């Protein structure tokens, strides 16, 4: 269905060195309600434009 | 470790296929295939894609 196509602005995260790093940031993003999509097998996730700065800030504080 | 800006598009498999057809024709639309129901698209092309999908589906002479 076309009526069900949804788009979102934001940022795609990738290039994680470890499963633990990927899941840490993925979990934090879910906790604060800004994670829109993820794929554990690729270690990627997509964060809303609104939430991106908080996720970056958390990453830089670890 | 790396982040890139884009537009996430969530859609059914048949719509994903149609957007890929749009990209093949016009280029510079799809940045990444993410999974069976998700694409990363050029943010400046989102409205184009939505309009084109509406035309493809609504103006089909076999409707």
Curated annotation (Swiss-Prot), chain A:
It comes from the Eukaryota. It is found in: Nucleus. Coiled coil: none annotated. Belongs to the TFB2 family. Present with 8900 molecules/cell in log phase SD medium. Component of the general transcription and DNA repair factor IIH (TFIIH) core complex, which is involved in general and transcription-coupled nucleotide excision repair (NER) of damaged DNA and, when complexed to TFIIK, in RNA transcription by RNA polymerase II. In NER, TFIIH acts by opening DNA around the lesion to allow the excision of the damaged oligonucleotide and its replacement by a new DNA fragment. In transcription, TFIIH has an essential role in transcription initiation. Component of the 7-subunit TFIIH core complex composed of XPB/SSL2, XPD/RAD3, SSL1, TFB1, TFB2, TFB4 and TFB5, which is active in NER. The core complex associates with the 3-subunit CTD-kinase module TFIIK composed of CCL1, KIN28 and TFB3 to form the 10-subunit holoenzyme (holo-TFIIH) active in transcription. An additionnal subunit, TFB6, plays a role in the dissociation of the SSL2 helicase from TFIIH after transcription initiation. Interacts with TFB5. This is General transcription and DNA repair factor IIH subunit TFB2. The lineage of its organism: Eukaryota, Fungi, Dikarya, Ascomycota, Saccharomycotina.
UniProtKB/Swiss-Prot annotation, chain B:
GO terms for cellular component: cytosol; nucleus; transcription factor TFIIH core complex; transcription factor TFIIH holo complex. It is found in: Nucleus. SUPFAM superfamilies: TFB5-like. GO terms for biological process: nucleotide-excision repair; nucleotide-excision repair, preincision complex assembly; transcription by RNA polymerase II; transcription initiation at RNA polymerase II promoter. Transmembrane segments: none annotated. Keywords: DNA damage, DNA repair, Nucleus, Transcription, Transcription regulation. The keyword Ubl conjugation does not apply. InterPro entries: TFB5-like_sf, TFIIH_TTDA/Tfb5. Component of the 7-subunit TFIIH core complex composed of XPB/SSL2, XPD/RAD3, SSL1, TFB1, TFB2, TFB4 and TFB5, which is active in NER. The core complex associates with the 3-subunit CTD-kinase module TFIIK composed of CCL1, KIN28 and TFB3 to form the 10-subunit holoenzyme (holo-TFIIH) active in transcription. An additionnal subunit, TFB6, plays a role in the dissociation of the SSL2 helicase from TFIIH after transcription initiation. Interacts with TFB2. Component of the general transcription and DNA repair factor IIH (TFIIH) core complex, which is involved in general and transcription-coupled nucleotide excision repair (NER) of damaged DNA and, when complexed to TFIIK, in RNA transcription by RNA polymerase II. In NER, TFIIH acts by opening DNA around the lesion to allow the excision of the damaged oligonucleotide and its replacement by a new DNA fragment. In transcription, TFIIH has an essential role in transcription initiation. Belongs to the TFB5 family. This is General transcription and DNA repair factor IIH subunit TFB5. It comes from Saccharomyces cerevisiae (strain ATCC 204508 / S288c). The lineage of its organism: Eukaryota, Fungi, Dikarya, Ascomycota, Saccharomycotina.
């Amino acid at each position: 269905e076309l009526d069900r196509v949804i788009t979102y602005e934001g940022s795609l995260y990738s290039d994680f060195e470890t499963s633990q790093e990927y899941n840490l940031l993925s979990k934090y993003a879910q906790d604060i309600g800004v994670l829109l999509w993820k794929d554990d097998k690729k270690k990627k996730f997509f964060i809303s434009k609104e939430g991106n700065s908080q996720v970056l800030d958390f990453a830089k504080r670890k | 470790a790396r982040a890139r800006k884009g537009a996430l598009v969530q859609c059914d498999p048949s719509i994903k296929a149609l957007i890929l057809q749009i990209d093949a024709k016009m280029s510079d639309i799809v940045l990444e295939e993410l999974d069976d129901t998700h694409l990363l698209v050029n943010p400046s092309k989102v409205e184009f894609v939505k309009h084109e999908l509406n035309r493809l589906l609504s103006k089909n002479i076999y409707n």
